[PDB]
């Protein structure tokens, strides 16, 4: 994804925001400078880009840049973005969360139940070349009481995990129900 | 276990540090508050013989020579990790010969 960025400086961050400009900061091992972007345009990008897909930033200098999103501070009350972090990549390995697709339906979901997705994505060390638009997991052998750890995953080539292997990815849990209530309130 | 040093440092000045080895015995006159040594009668660095308890009493006077020649007297004895008795007591007993 691409997005037109602009340089920032003395301008009051609050004043910017009144206009429509969400301030932010691109930086990395060697680089660092204040910037900003048009908020409305940012939203349209981030609604799919998030912290997973890469984002090329175009400065007025025409400079393309393979940035990522490292964090977006939010304003409590009317959940909304304050300011953006842009991690500019080079070619060396860089940690980042990658999406996950829990394809298939366990016996749990069929026999009444619900798949809780503990991690909607996973943190893995990888080169900017390897930007797998997603990993997959055959969640189907799962059932109420069962669980999947990172100790087993559709790890593509070159993509090694940085999170602990024993971290749980997801699990199927029993459903909340009405006939439980009569039993519950008894205690 | 260097409680001994802490206790001495609090007092006057001129700490007579007395490190000693399996076949060695050294001694410095350190005026702290600056971390500098003024005198240093080494043994296995001087040349002395071999008898240790007899050797230490000698190296003790080696300080006395170099000490007074500068103007020193605070006998503040840094009996290090070693208990005052053997080649230390002798090194001391000897130092106190002057």
């Amino acid at each position: 994804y691409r997005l037109k960025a602009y340089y920032r400086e003395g301008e009051k961050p609050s004043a910017l925001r009144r206009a429509g400009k969400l301030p932010g900061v691109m930086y990395n091992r060697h680089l660092n400078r204040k910037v900003y972007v048009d908020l409305v345009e940012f939203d349209k990008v981030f609604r799919q880009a998030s912290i997973h897909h890469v984002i090329v930033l175009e400065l007025p200098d025409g400079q393309s840049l393979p940035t990522l999103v490292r964090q977006v501070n939010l304003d409590k009350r009317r959940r909304r973005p304050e300011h953006v972090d842009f991690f500019v990549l080079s070619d060396e390995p860089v940690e980042m969360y990658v999406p996950l697709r829990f394809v298939g339906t366990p016996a749990g979901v069929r026999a009444g139940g619900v798949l809780q997705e503990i991690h909607r994505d996973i943190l893995v060390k990888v080169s900017p070349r390897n930007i797998p638009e997603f990993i997959e997991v055959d969640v189907s052998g799962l059932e109420i009481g069962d669980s999947l750890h990172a100790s087993d995953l559709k790890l593509p080539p070159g993509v090694e995990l940085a999170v602990s292997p024993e971290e749980t990815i997801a699990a199927v849990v029993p459903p909340e129900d009405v006939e439980k209530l009569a039993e519950e309130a008894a205690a | 276990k260097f409680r001994v040093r802490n206790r001495i440092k609090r007092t006057g000045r001129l700490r007579l540090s007395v490190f000693r080895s399996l076949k060695h015995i050294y001694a410095q006159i350190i005026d702290d508050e600056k971390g500098v040594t003024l005198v240093s009668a080494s043994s296995l660095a001087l040349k002395l013989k071999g008898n240790k308890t007899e050797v230490a009493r000698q190296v003790g006077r080696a300080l006395a020579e170099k000490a007074l020649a500068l103007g020193i007297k605070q006998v503040a004895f840094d009996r290090g990790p070693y208990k005052y008795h053997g080649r230390v007591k002798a090194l001391a007993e000897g130092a106190r010969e002057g």
């Binding site: 998030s50 939010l74 409590k76 959940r79 619900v114 459903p175 909340e176 129900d177 006939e179 209530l181 | -």
Partner: protein, 134 residues
């Protein structure tokens, strides 16, 4: 539970930490006004929720009453309230996420949460899991 005894009232200042993001489930109900939420409130909402979609998905509750709410018994002015008549409440600054739902259609969770709102004193908002994460 445990803690100890009864506790001062304090004040519900700005919703500084009174804000949040969804961390479980697809949909959520966030507060918009500061308030002490009672146990009787939290519960009544939670039950009325499942009660709505029987044998449905799974609900999460991220606010929890740890504050003892005191109350003198129809008299004058001695000592601290025997209190606890309303027992325990949870501090809620405007912006904090309270209830998560999961494993149900949008119209199935747009109602469940719509209701839980009513059982609450404050005005509240429903939310999709936007896309804001960490």
């Amino acid at each position: 539970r445990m803690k100890y005894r009864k506790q001062q009232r304090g004040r519900l200042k700005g919703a500084t930490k009174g804000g949040d993001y969804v961390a479980f489930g697809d949909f959520g109900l966030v507060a918009l006004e500061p308030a002490w939420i009672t146990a009787q409130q939290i519960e009544a909402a939670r039950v009325a929720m499942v009660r709505h979609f029987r044998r449905g998905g799974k609900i999460f509750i991220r606010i929890f009453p740890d504050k003892p709410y005191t109350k003198k018994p129809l008299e004058v002015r001695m000592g601290k309230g025997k209190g606890n008549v309303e027992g325990y409440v949870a501090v809620v600054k405007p912006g904090r996420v309270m209830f998560e739902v999961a494993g149900v259609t949008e119209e199935q969770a747009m109602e469940a949460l719509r209701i839980a709102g009513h059982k609450l004193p404050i005005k509240t908002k429903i939310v999709r899991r936007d896309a804001y994460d960490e």
